[PDB]
UniProtKB/Swiss-Prot annotation:
Induction: Up-regulated following treatment with IFNG/IFN-gamma. This is Death-associated protein kinase 1. Ubiquitinated by the BCR(KLHL20) E3 ubiquitin ligase complex, leading to its degradation by the proteasome. Interacts with KLHL20. Interacts (via death domain) with MAPK1 and MAPK3. Interacts with MAP1B (via N-terminus). Interacts with PRKD1 in an oxidative stress-regulated manner. Interacts with PIN1, PDCD6, BECN1, TSC2 and STX1A. Interacts (via kinase domain) with DAPK3 (via kinase domain). Interacts with GRINB. Interacts (via death domain) with UNC5B (via death domain). Interacts with UNC5C (via death domain). Calcium/calmodulin-dependent serine/threonine kinase involved in multiple cellular signaling pathways that trigger cell survival, apoptosis, and autophagy. Regulates both type I apoptotic and type II autophagic cell deaths signal, depending on the cellular setting. The former is caspase-dependent, while the latter is caspase-independent and is characterized by the accumulation of autophagic vesicles. Phosphorylates PIN1 resulting in inhibition of its catalytic activity, nuclear localization, and cellular function. Phosphorylates TPM1, enhancing stress fiber formation in endothelial cells. Isoform 2 cannot induce apoptosis but can induce membrane blebbing. Coiled coil: none annotated. The chain holds residues 2 to 277 of 1430 of the full protein. Belongs to the protein kinase superfamily. CAMK Ser/Thr protein kinase family. DAP kinase subfamily. Isoform 2 is expressed in normal intestinal tissue as well as in colorectal carcinomas.
Length: 281
């Protein structure tokens, strides 16, 4: 599939950089014809078929076609796509309040209600995605952004569909591996993956929201991955002493090694607490 090949600078002006990754940089931008603001994500293309640098066209097209499907308050909206010899440029909805990662770092310690307010929105977004058989495969605080960080209950959107896949056969067996702290055991063990992996990541996020600590983090990536595979985590009393038993129950039912025994997104919404690359160089 071909994208718009006109120079993006003829149609947009760019400003502040919002994110910078391995082979993707995000710049705030403004469409000249409307004055509307967006986030332009520049994805580096691969220069040769056998290269390890850049993103394969197959991977770029997958991200774009998934983004084209989705429209929901808790996920970003893709506006248009440009390309040139070096990059594919995705013009995405601007989420101006920053990453949840930074909000948590700057604020520190979310009450149980504040955690549940964020979590309910994440669950609603993932319910939408999973209903569409889309696995995100990279859920973590850095991939959730706030619309406005200066309100008591910030609204959020899930971003970064670079690892997302359609799961039309119940599982996928590809080169899929996210951030060690957040990946499920089946990712660590290179086993087929499905929607269940996202539910594990939600368990990790919930643990972090409530405590400010990461459940499986070791001093090296290999130790984190080993901890994940062994389900080597516990609720530290110093961080969880005023956290309800029902919140712990929720987490416990998500941080389950066997994907078939883990709560699904629908289970998570009915749970009583809620119901109304991977290598060191
Ligand atoms: Cl993104």
């Amino acid at each position: 599939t071909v994208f718009r090949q006109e120079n993006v600078d003829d149609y947009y002006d760019t400003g502040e950089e919002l994110g910078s990754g391995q082979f993707a940089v995000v710049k705030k931008c403004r469409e000249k014809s409307t004055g509307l603001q967006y986030a332009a994500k520049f994805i580096k293309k691969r220069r040769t078929k056998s290269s390890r640098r850049g993103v394969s066209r197959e991977d770029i097209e997958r991200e774009v076609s998934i983004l084209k499907e989705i429209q929901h308050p808790n996920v970003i909206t893709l506006h248009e796509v440009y390309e040139n010899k070096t990059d594919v440029i995705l013009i995405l909805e601007l989420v101006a309040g920053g990453e949840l990662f930074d909000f948590l770092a700057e604020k520190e310690s979310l009450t149980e209600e504040e955690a549940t307010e964020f979590l309910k929105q994440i669950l609603n977004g993932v319910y939408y995605l999973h209903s569409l058989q889309i696995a995100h495969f990279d859920l973590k605080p850095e991939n959730i952004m706030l619309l406005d960080r200066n309100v008591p209950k910030p609204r959020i959107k899930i971003i970064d569909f670079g690892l997302a896949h359609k799961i039309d056969f119940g599982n996928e067996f590809k080169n899929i591996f996210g951030t060690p702290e957040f990946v499920a055991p089946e990712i660590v063990n290179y086993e087929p993956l499905g929607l269940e992996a996202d539910m594990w990541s939600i368990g990790v996020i919930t643990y972090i929201l409530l405590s400010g600590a990461s459940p499986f983090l070791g001093d090296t990536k290999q130790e984190t991955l080993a901890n994940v595979s062994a389900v080597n985590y516990e609720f530290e009393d110093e961080y969880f002493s005023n956290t309800s038993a029902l919140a712990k129950d929720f987490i416990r039912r998500l941080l389950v090694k066997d994907p078939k025994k883990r709560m699904t997104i629908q289970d998570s919404l009915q749970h009583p607490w809620i119901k109304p690359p991977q290598f060191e160089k």
